[PDB]
Ligand binder design. Structure first.
Ligand SMILES: [Mg+2]
Ligand SMILES: [Mg+2]
Ligand SMILES: [Mg+2]
Lengths: 160, 139, 139, 139, 160, 160
């Protein structure tokens, strides 16, 4: 149990007081005859660590319009936010996940921490869409069933 | 006891003038009232008044940003601007951007004066308590 | 009675340092004098001093903008800069632009000190009373 | 005697938070202590706190610049930000640039609170005494 | 006649006072035995509305170098400005009226509130100048008198 | 010897006091029976002119990382800086001296106050380097000794 130094305001005597646990604050310091008295965080406030604060801290993190609550305000911690689905965090902002243009496909979708990753479609695959989900797909094997009218590109399927 | 106010940004603001947080966090309000976006003076005299507003956006289009502190009372049906700043051509088109505007000075104010802050672009304002605020004190 | 000054931009300024309006509008001047662009201290002590200047132009060419508050007295034949800000690369070439510079801090000043404000580009300054100003108060 | 501080930029700063000059030049320190970048409050009460930092560079790459004034004491093992400004997309890529950030407001502070200033990019800071500073006074 | 509430400073009694008209201010509030006394705005100041101000407002609008007085400072109103001839108002500035280049002609000149409007010259008309006034004019009918050396363009007259 | 007006704080009597010379300050004003007493600037401070200051000024000019001391802090003057070798002064910064590209040669090197000056190499000369020192040099006279394989350009010597 952690402690803190405190001079009695009545006497000036040098005391060792016990600190209050997360979710509480110091309501009355210890004195010669009694220990520290902790009280409970009131609504909207918090203490996350052992402390000797004389009031709780306000939950001053609020979630903007492109964010959602990753953790709630609670007597033992502030609120925390992340980017809502579709967005990722960059230099304090919540940015829209990129789309991979035609000719390129998704090799990793966007997360709350990363943007969409794209590759140029490799030989024998295509992507015809600007899309933040669509992956490069193999061309149809025309010959495997007609014969080819036009060979596929990285952006268009093979035509029969 | 010193007349004083320090209020912090309120996310709720749907309209002009801005509203402010008067109870929670790192705020002060003593011998001065808060009513509908407004700080209400109750003792005539000299006050230093200040405000900061923090603007930011994903994609700059250099929309003019304006920030004003103004006074209204019942004696005249029109506001008086006490201080104001405007920003134009402040970012590079299409980039993420951020900038603040700071205003502070001394004014003689009268009992029943109401002070407010206004801004051009409510949607570019960020309301974090340490970034956007409005306050005063009696000298 | 509190020593105090709040002066507003004067359009007339043809030269450096700037001149200020000391009589009309939302101004104050009490136990401190105004003489040729200068606020003259008459009681030694601690003062908070502040100034804002509002710059703007039709067509940005990123001319450096400088804003200084400085002190002069008879005891030395050279000025002392108390605070200063400089802006460079503040707008996009060719656009309409606007930006302010804000300065405020505490200083120990002596009787017969004269305080002035200087700027790099007089022609880019806008002198509206709520936009450009210069003031102080005794703590 | 008035509790007061006005400190100026210290070039030495190798780390965060910044260090400040407390003895030479146009500085003040009375009834408030300076210890390792920090102003130490010794009398509980209301103080106006302010800081300016001057940033500049040869060749803009729009590195985000951040400037914060924060408080620390022994009662909690985590800092509290009192005021902060951030700049993004503030210059034209590749140009010489300069810009300052100004912060000032009122706070209730307690005996044994330590106040500090932090910045994102230590290498873009210029430390001239009139350009970069940190101060407060007891109301 | 509009009114306002006022407590006597002598008694505290609750009175209904008459307000002062544009061009005046309250010099002495009403009391039990006399009405409000208004005085006249001094030079450079004004009151535009019924009021109970205790001093007039300063005419704090001033006309920059590309502006002119649209209305004067007067006891009953502030000064007002507009852009001088040749300029128009945009986002607080007074901008020069544009010129229509060669190939284009003026379909509306600049006003204090609008920029010059241009059209590309329509068939059979031209404008050879960069001009904020010149309109598209019809080509000369060469044949209507020589024969044509070169047909006109939108920027050059027909040559004979 | 310059002077200054001073009222005795003891009497209020109007006196003419002598000022202190560079490197000193006023330690004690003159009074009816003694002259001004000057003291010497303490370390890190200075007075450059005759003065009646009551303390010296701080040497508040400091040399950034691309600068060097052109003059030291001294009781009779502040420090002064200039750009270190390789740099020049421009709008408060110390900029690197430019290099003249291939095809261009140095006609004046950089100084602390000026950038490198370049000319395009004149006929019969070349510069093959991006260099802040290299000047345009004449082509070799191949014929003056082989015959020419390729005539020189402004960026390449004549080949044999
Ligand atoms: Mg795709
Ligand atoms: Mg035309
Ligand atoms: Mg070369």
């Amino acid at each position: 149990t952690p402690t803190y130094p405190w001079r009695d305001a009545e006497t000036g005597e040098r005391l060792v007081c016990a600190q209050c646990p997360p979710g509480t604050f110091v309501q009355r310091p210890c004195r010669r005859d009694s220990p520290t008295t902790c009280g409970p965080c009131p609504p909207r406030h918090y203490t996350q660590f052992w402390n000797y604060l004389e009031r709780c801290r306000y939950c001053n993190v609020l979630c903007g319009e492109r964010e959602e609550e990753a953790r709630a305000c609670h007597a033992t911690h502030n609120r925390a936010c992340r980017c809502r689905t579709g967005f990722f965090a960059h230099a304090g902002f919540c940015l829209e996940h990129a789309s991979c243009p035609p000719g390129a496909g998704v090799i990793a979708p966007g997360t709350p921490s990363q943007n969409t990753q794209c590759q140029p479609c490799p030989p024998g695959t295509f992507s015809a869409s600007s899309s933040s989900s669509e992956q490069c797909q193999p061309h149809r094997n025309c010959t495997a069933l007609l014969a080819l009218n036009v060979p596929g590109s990285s952006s268009h399927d093979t035509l029969c | 006891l010193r007349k004083v106010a320090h209020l912090t940004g309120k996310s709720n603001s749907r309209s002009m003038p801005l509203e402010w947080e008067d109870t929670y966090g790192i705020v002060l309000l003593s011998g001065v009232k808060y009513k509908k976006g407004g700080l209400v003076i109750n003792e005539t005299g000299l006050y230093f008044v200040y405000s900061k507003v923090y603007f930011r956006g994903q994609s700059c289009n250099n929309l003019p940003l304006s920030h004003k502190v103004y006074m209204r009372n019942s004696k005249y049906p029109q506001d008086l601007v006490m201080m104001e700043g405007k920003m134009m051509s402040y970012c590079t088109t299409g980039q993420m951007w951020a900038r603040s505007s700071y205003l502070g000075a001394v004014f003689n104010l009268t009992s029943a004066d109401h002070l407010y802050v206004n801004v051009s672009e409510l949607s570019l304002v960020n309301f974090e308590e340490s970034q956007t605020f409005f306050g005063l004190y009696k000298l």
